[PDB]
Amino acid sequence: MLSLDYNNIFIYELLTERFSSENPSSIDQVVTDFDGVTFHISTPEEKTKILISLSMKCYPELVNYGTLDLLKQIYGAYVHEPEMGYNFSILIDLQQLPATDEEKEQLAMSISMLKRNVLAAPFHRAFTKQAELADLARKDPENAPMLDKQATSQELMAIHYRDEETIVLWPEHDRVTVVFSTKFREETDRIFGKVFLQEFVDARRRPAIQTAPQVLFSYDPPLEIRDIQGIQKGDDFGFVTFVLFERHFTPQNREDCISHIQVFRNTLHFHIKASKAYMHQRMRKRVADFQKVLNRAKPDVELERKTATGRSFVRA
Amino acid sequence: TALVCDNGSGLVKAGFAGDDAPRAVFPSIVGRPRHQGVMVGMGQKDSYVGDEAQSKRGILTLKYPIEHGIITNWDDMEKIWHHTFYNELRVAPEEHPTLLTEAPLNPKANREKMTQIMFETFNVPAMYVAIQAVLSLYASGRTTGIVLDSGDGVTHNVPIYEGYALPHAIMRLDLAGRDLTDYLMKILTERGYSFVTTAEREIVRDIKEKLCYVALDFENEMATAASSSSLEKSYELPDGQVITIGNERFRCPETLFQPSFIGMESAGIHETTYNSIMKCDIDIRKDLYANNVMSGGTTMYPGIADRMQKEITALAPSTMKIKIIAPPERKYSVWIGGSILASLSTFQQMWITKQEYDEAGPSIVHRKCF
Ligand SMILES: Nc1ncnc2c1ncn2[C@@H]1O[C@H](COP(=O)(O)OP(=O)(O)O)[C@@H](O)[C@H]1O
Numbered sequence: 001m002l003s004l005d006y007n008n009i010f011i012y013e014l015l016t017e018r019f020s021s022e023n024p025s026s027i028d029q030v031v032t033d034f035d036g037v038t039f040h041i042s043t044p045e046e047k048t049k050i051l052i053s054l055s056m057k058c059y060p061e062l063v064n065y066g067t068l069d070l071l072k073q074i075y076g077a078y079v080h081e082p083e084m085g086y087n088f089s090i091l092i093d094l095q096q097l098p099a100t101d102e103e104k105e106q107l108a109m110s111i112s113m114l115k116r117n118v119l120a121a122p123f124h125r126a127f128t129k130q131a132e133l134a135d136l137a138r139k140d141p142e143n144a145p146m147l148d149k150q151a152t153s154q155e156l157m158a159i160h161y162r163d164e165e166t167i168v169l170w171p172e173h174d175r176v177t178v179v180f181s182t183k184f185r186e187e188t189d190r191i192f193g194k195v196f197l198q199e200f201v202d203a204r205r206r207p208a209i210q211t212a213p214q215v216l217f218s219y220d221p222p223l224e225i226r227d228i229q230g231i232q233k234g235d236d237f238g239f240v241t242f243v244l245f246e247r248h249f250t251p252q253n254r255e256d257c258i259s260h261i262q263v264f265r266n267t268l269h270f271h272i273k274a275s276k277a278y279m280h281q282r283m284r285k286r287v288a289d290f291q292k293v294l295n296r297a298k299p300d301v302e303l304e305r306k307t308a309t310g311r312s313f314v315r316a
Numbered sequence: 317t318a319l320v321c322d323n324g325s326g327l328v329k330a331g332f333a334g335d336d337a338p339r340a341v342f343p344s345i346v347g348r349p350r351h352q353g354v355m356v357g358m359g360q361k362d363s364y365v366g367d368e369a370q371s372k373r374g375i376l377t378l379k380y381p382i383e384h385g386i387i388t389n390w391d392d393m394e395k396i397w398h399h400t401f402y403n404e405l406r407v408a409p410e411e412h413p414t415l416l417t418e419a420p421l422n423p424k425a426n427r428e429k430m431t432q433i434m435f436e437t438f439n440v441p442a443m444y445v446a447i448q449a450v451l452s453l454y455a456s457g458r459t460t461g462i463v464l465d466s467g468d469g470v471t472h473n474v475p476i477y478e479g480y481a482l483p484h485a486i487m488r489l490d491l492a493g494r495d496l497t498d499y500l501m502k503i504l505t506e507r508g509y510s511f512v513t514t515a516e517r518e519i520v521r522d523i524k525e526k527l528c529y530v531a532l533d534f535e536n537e538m539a540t541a542a543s544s545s546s547l548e549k550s551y552e553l554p555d556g557q558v559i560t561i562g563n564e565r566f567r568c569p570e571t572l573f574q575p576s577f578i579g580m581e582s583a584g585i586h587e588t589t590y591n592s593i594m595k596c597d598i599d600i601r602k603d604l605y606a607n608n609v610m611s612g613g614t615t616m617y618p619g620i621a622d623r624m625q626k627e628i629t630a631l632a633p634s635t636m637k638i639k640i641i642a643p644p645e646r647k648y649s650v651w652i653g654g655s656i657l658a659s660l661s662t663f664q665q666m667w668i669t670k671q672e673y674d675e676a677g678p679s680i681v682h683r684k685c686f
């Protein structure tokens with residue numbers, strides 16, 4: 001794969017099966033995800049009713065940024081009391097499904113998309129508040145610099161979403177900026193990750209992708225994040241900044257932009273792994289070139305004729 | 317009525333005397349098509365002027381017939397004045413007297429040919445040609461001040477006290493919006509954005525007008541741009557491809573404060589206003605420091621009145637207050653001052669009359685314009 005899926009593939013396939021199934025069997029399935037996230041899928045009272053529950057170490061921060069309001073808006077009547085050891089939960093009853101295969105499919109998709117929906121609330125808070133600041137700056141363009149300066153501190157979201165990544169973001173009247181305070185702790189991934197983070201920033205300087213968010217990189221923090229608690233300028237973090245401008249979160253594009261920015265460091269981590277398989281095929285191709293330099297030391301002798309199983313042959 | 321025309325190096329402002337704003341504002345441009353032309357009957361035209369040249373610019377060589385405040389192509393200026401009266405303002409110049417407008421320390425022949433074309437081509441009943449910056453005093457309701465005027469072609473300073481100008485203290489600087497547009501093309505190239513044609517010159521002029529501003533402290537904004545995420549701005553080109561710029565937004569206008577950015581050996585606009593005040597008589601300087609008028613479109617950058625108030629209070633003594641008079645209307649204040657002067661009830665003896673020209677030739681202008 002060149003790109004990661006945004007949704008949990010197991011939850012999508014399992015719900016696409018059970019929403020079609022003539023005879024649902026029971027399930028009891030803990031399922032891992034990226035960034036230390038985990039799901040429990042089960043039928044805890046009837047084979048008819050599936051409980052899907054999410055566990056996520058940053059969920060208490062995400063609730064401060066309007067997450068429960070967005071999850072109630074997305075999942076509606078299916079929202080359920082949290083399961084013990086899990087932060088959020090949804091109950092789907094297999095006799096209560098939508099009347100069409102296409103509504104069933106987009107519900108199986110919506111429930112598989114749950115990790116990126118819980119994590120989308122700080123981005124929707126930034127996009128909707130940028131629209132307020134945009135309207136105020138359109139009212140008085142000479143007051144806008146002070147609105148942007150106060151929103152840079154009063155409307156900043158930080159999410160410590162895993163112990164080696166902090167995502168920091170804020171609205172200003174024409175943009176959302178998001179900074180990945182980013183690190184690789186495994187030493188070969190830190191070495192290959194320096195090449196990946198360098199070529200990522202240099203790619204944005206080429207003519208072909210000027211349509212993309214502005215990207216910046218350093219390894220001290222961007223000025224407006226230097227005093228956010230848990231950011232630290234000597235602690236081997238690099239800081240990838242994306243400036244999303246109004247064109248990157250236009251109404252036709254908000255949800256794809258959110259899905260795609262959250263998976264940034266996951267695509268980089270995955271491709272640092274997949275680059276090793278590429279280097280290994282690059283290596284064994286020129287092991288096969290060096291074979292031909294040793295084969296010229298073999299003196300030329302005809303081998304006896306052999307059948308496909310290696311048994312000796314007696315003709316010609 | 318009289319008519320008021322401000323013959324801008326970049327932008328014509330034209331209208332009736334006694335109106336509160338120009339009727340016509342349009343590019344001081346003539347466009348000639350540079351490609352072959354292949355569809356007969358489809359309304360091809362041999363040259364284009366103003367907004368029509370600006371609108372069709374992709375197939376055109378655009379030329380400005382005024383540069384550094386002097387007319388360098390008189391044939392194209394006859395086209396711009398013809399377009400001004402007949403196409404844009406909808407008037408016969410045969411029956412309306414015209415206030416024209418001119419920069420200080422121009423060539424004498426610029427004044428002469430400008431009066432000659434008005435009488436011998438446009439047949440005007442009478443005309444005048446006012447110094448561009450003393451009109452900007454009239455617009456502000458004021459008889460004392462030093463005015464910085466910076467349009468597209470020139471920056472100039474005139475000190476005036478109780479309605480009397482100090483002509484030895486007048487000084488001119490061949491650096492304004494044109495040179496800032498050329499330097500923005502120069503420094504957009506280092507982000508990878510090559511703009512080369514005289515049509516792309518107008519795209520960079522629009523990037524300058526939309527994105528540029530002046531730093532209150534240049535080295536502090538250069539340090540802020542080293543963590544650039546707040547100063548980066550995107551702009552979309554006519555083709556829908558985009559550029560993103562950071563320190564180019566304030567490095568461009570800083571050429572007004574540091575002309576050495578374009579290799580020019582001259583004082584910046586702050587030091588040139590101070591040098592013009594210090595050329596004046598000692599007891600008038602207090603009232604000029606208090607009355608620094610800003611005018612013309614190159615004074616429209618965000619932050620420029622604050623940067624000017626700062627950098628003059630750093631040159632001047634602390635014993636008197638300095639304030640910058642930068643109205644929101646200041647793009648048109650030269651034309652507004654001409655609308656006042658051409659309607660003002662004691663000005664009607666000061667016109668150069670057609671018979672008064674016919675008696676003397678175009679040298680008549682020097683003995684009554686200034
Ligand atoms: N908002 C602005 N910000 C910066 N530069 C401006 C702005 N508006 C206009 N300009 C500059 O001012 C020039 C026109 O100013 P103007 O006073 O009309 O000059 P001129 O009379 O000499 O033609 C433009 O061509 C451009 O360089």
Ligand SMILES: [Mg+2]
Nearest residue numbers: 324325467468
């Ligand atoms: Mg001008």
